[PDB]
Point group: C7
Chain length 193, copies 7
């Protein structure tokens, strides 16, 4: 939370104020994995996918030049040819910021990955040597409870903390690759056009 | 609480100051489920319904142009035809902000859902296999105590934490659908009129 | 306490500065129920009643136009007829704010209700089935100790937490009804006069 | 401590800055009852009495018009008759603020009352039924240790927490009566002169 | 620490900024009594005596008019007779502030008194009745360890907390007498010269 | 986190604002060593290497003179000869700040060193005397779990805390050498060119 | 950390901003004694010696008049004779501030002394009476672990807390002597030149 208060007053700005808004909203959001073999994937991917869509729509709405764009696109011939495209692309670029920040933040803190890819993941290195031959339905039901400290009661079968750290490392690697690709794309866009 | 201090000074504004007011008021509100089979639904739905109504009335009151609206609507013919409707609709739109923020915040933190829909919910996956045949009145009385950590003393029958996470996920899904529908409506309103 | 720091700088104001003053004073006030069958009601109703009276007097005192009102009311004929009534009613309205805030805050946090109406309340649903036939003097003395966690040592007779939550819900319902009635009255006053 | 930071910037002032100074000084003062039958009363009454005297002297000193008052009172005839009395009374009134704040704060938090009036108080309702006949010297020595959690080791004789709450309620009642009388006096002074 | 942040911005000042500097420096200073019969007195009196001397020297150094004073005192006859004495006395008075604040703060928090006067103090009321006849060298070595919670392991001989509270009360009494005498002297100085 | 809030407002700046950005980002980054003999080195070196590369790219992007550099380098002959090189080198120098801050901070807090060089390190002084003759594959697998408090369960073989402190000291030595070399290079650059 | 935030805004300054920088950097630095008989002295003296050297170099670099000094010292005859020496000495004096602050802070908090002089110190008063005759190599290895709470497991031989307090007192005495000598030197410099 201190990171938001620090990065504040930097723009001082409406463009770079939704970024800290999304970051702080994630910081004050109670992630709760259902820890069920059926609804884990859905919940994880939903937390990963839906809030950025909503932030996109919100950034499109809060821009004071949607009215003019609608008025011009509505006429068969509006009062120029492509200053409209300019402000439209500027609006889209300004809007695309907060979704990227949300996705980066939720990837660096690998809760959604841990909640989503836990039941199906291949954890054969962490499963105990005694219970190394059992129905994968049992392993599904057990591994589903890994992101839940309070519900997991199968310490004699799978080390919970080892698998947690493994999947969190995977999630952080993915987040860093995402950040690098995004920054390269921004570099090309600013250096070409 | 840090989210409110961060989002402050953004408008700097009386319109976008009731939003943080309602958010902070929820943050500093001691939600207390009665954990009784009779008054759970009432308390949950009341916390969900009444404070937004009060915020609506308050936002209507704090606007300095209710006096002029009353004076004009009181005359059979006032000193124009529809600049009154304009300021009235502006007042209503400004007022409708804080109820939406309250409902969104109280849905993302699924306490009201957990308090309200716990006694009647169908929790057959979490009920123990031994006590899978008993009077639904007993299950009513037991499930009523799920939102109360201090009162629940039936660990041999129902896993409390699993059901809590389940209902909290449901509540968060509902909150996200609410936010998306609200944002789409705002988008249409700003893009048409 | 963060709510006061957030709502600060909003008026920026002497009128809307006693509200946060009373709220913060309640936040930093050590409520201590005597937990005796004789002095519970007195203490609860006193905490509910006296501080708003004091805030009323204080708001009357801190207004710089009591001297002029006294000087005019003292003369048999003062130097107009009813600009005095105007400033007097404005002073009274400005003063009536902080008592309302104090009463609302102390009702939402149902300590005074829990301290006051505990010894006399009808708690027959929470009393154990074994001790369901005993002198109501015994129940008086026992229920008096409900708001005190450190003094209550009768867990085999009455569930303390259940009764606490029950009475806190009642208090919050009363507080919400109070807020709604107050806001309706303010609405009528602003819309008529 | 948050109350001081909140009430700050309100005057923005040298008059209403010693009030928060005294309040904060009490907040950051380590009250330590000696818990001995001989020095309890002395310590309690001293903490109640001496700091307000010191604040009075300090408020008299920090006012830049003591030099002129001394120079005029020193002459047999000074260069008017009673503008001196005016500034003297203004200085005295400005000085009398911080002692009142200190006394109110130290009364609302009933430590000085608990430390002072504990050894001599009549606690016959809290003394156990077994030890209801013993030399009042023993009760003196025992009750002296009531404000000390770490020293009290006579739980089989007197309930410490009950007596603590009782005396704290008495102290808060006294503090509220003090505040009411002070505010009434200020009201009369402002409404008459 | 909140007291310093509160008293800040009051002067807004270089004179009244060393006071909060010394107070905060004491607040962030790790007092560590050696708890040995030989070096307790030395450490206590040193913490009481040396830092105020250093603050005196520092306040003398940070004043931009020592160069002129040296240049004038160096000449046999400088370019007036006693405007030098005026600025010298003003410098000395400005410098004497921080030592007083340090001494007051370190007296109100009776650590230095507890560390210094513990081995030699007469604690015959707290010593157990069994060990009331033993070589005062043993009592010296034992009482030396009173300010150290981690080292004291003689609970069967002397109550540590009782003696701690006793000596802390003595220290606070001394601190209050010091503050009163200082304020009286300042009053006389401002009212005479 | 307080260090960032303190060093803020110092530049008041876009150049010296990415430094605190990177420092705060490290402060709010959840380092999680996988504690596996295969992926420890990779994770440690990645955390050490990749974020500074990303900060370099970001500092290159956020500078408003990449467009002009591209436009000039694109032409066979641009509209001078080497004012381009000047602004290019200034941009590169401004960009190189945040990577250095990240590397210094992550070296002073020896987590990456502890995670990376733990499985291969030579810890023969800390290994117990009983298990001083065993397959280095066993020691590899065991030492891999040293940075994980929750996973390490081999206290009868290797002291975890001793090895942790050893490797953290090594990391801090490396960080200090890095800082010294960087500062010497900056000194030469500023004193020559 | 609050001391830095308090002493901030005092200069408001680039000269007196490195002082708080070094103080805060020490506050947010994880001191970790290796607790080995060979590398304790090295680590302690290094933490005491190297960071002030780096702060000296940094303060020399951040001053905007090293370029002019180099340009003038480079010529056989520069465009006056000794205004160069003036700005050079001013730069050196401004640079010497932060090393002094670092050394003072690290001496008042006697970790470096405790880490460095623990293995070689003469602790014959704290060593148990049973183990008062043993090879000083054993005492070396044991005393090396005194600054480490988690590693020290020889409570039957040496009291760890007593020796810790002893060495911390020694370190604080040294720090106070350092501060006094530094202030006297500054006094002489300001009063003579
Ligand atoms: C594996 O299972 C055995 C029981 O067969 C148990 O004793 C052992 O502690 C388990 N180990 C792990 C790492 O789960
Ligand atoms: C279910 O009930 C049995 C008793 O028949 C008990 O042993 C078991 O622990 C219970 N399990 C759960 C998950 O409630
Ligand atoms: C009720 O009293 C019985 C003793 O007759 C006791 O065993 C039981 O735990 C009590 N239950 C409650 C809810 O107080
Ligand atoms: C009163 O004393 C008796 C011993 O006679 C003891 O058993 C009981 O717990 C005591 N009760 C209280 C409230 O002190
Ligand atoms: C005093 O010493 C006796 C042993 O003779 C011990 O039983 C008792 O607890 C001690 N009391 C105190 C207050 O030290
Ligand atoms: C070393 O191993 C032995 C068992 O042979 C055990 O008793 C001892 O505690 C161990 N010591 C350490 C420091 O690991
Ligand atoms: C000293 O060693 C003896 C064993 O000979 C032990 O009983 C005693 O507790 C030890 N005391 C200290 C202070 O180390």
């Amino acid at each position: 939370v201190q990171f938001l208060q620090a990065n504040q007053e930097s723009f001082m700005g409406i463009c770079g104020i939704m970024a800290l808004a999304s970051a702080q909203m994630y910081s004050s959001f109670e992630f709760t994995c259902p820890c069920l073999p059926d609804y884990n994937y859905a919940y994880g991917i939903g937390i990963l996918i839906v809030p950025p869509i909503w932030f996109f729509l919100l950034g499109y709405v809060m821009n004071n030049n949607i009215s003019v764009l609608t008025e011009e696109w509505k006429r068969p011939v509006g009062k120029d040819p492509a200053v409209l495209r300019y402000m439209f692309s500027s609006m889209t670029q300004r809007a695309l910021i907060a979704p990227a920040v949300w996705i980066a933040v939720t990837l660096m803190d690998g809760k959604s990955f841990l909640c989503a890819f836990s039941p199906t993941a291949d954890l054969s290195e962490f499963v105990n040597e005694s219970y190394q031959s059992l129905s994968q339905k049992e392993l599904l039901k057990i591994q589903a409870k890994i992101p839940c400290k309070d519900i997991f009661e199968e310490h004699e079968i799978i080390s919970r903390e080892a698998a947690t750290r493994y999947i969190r490392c995977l999630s952080q690697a993915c987040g860093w690759t995402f950040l690098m690709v995004i920054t390269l794309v921004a570099f090309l866009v600013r250096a070409i056009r």
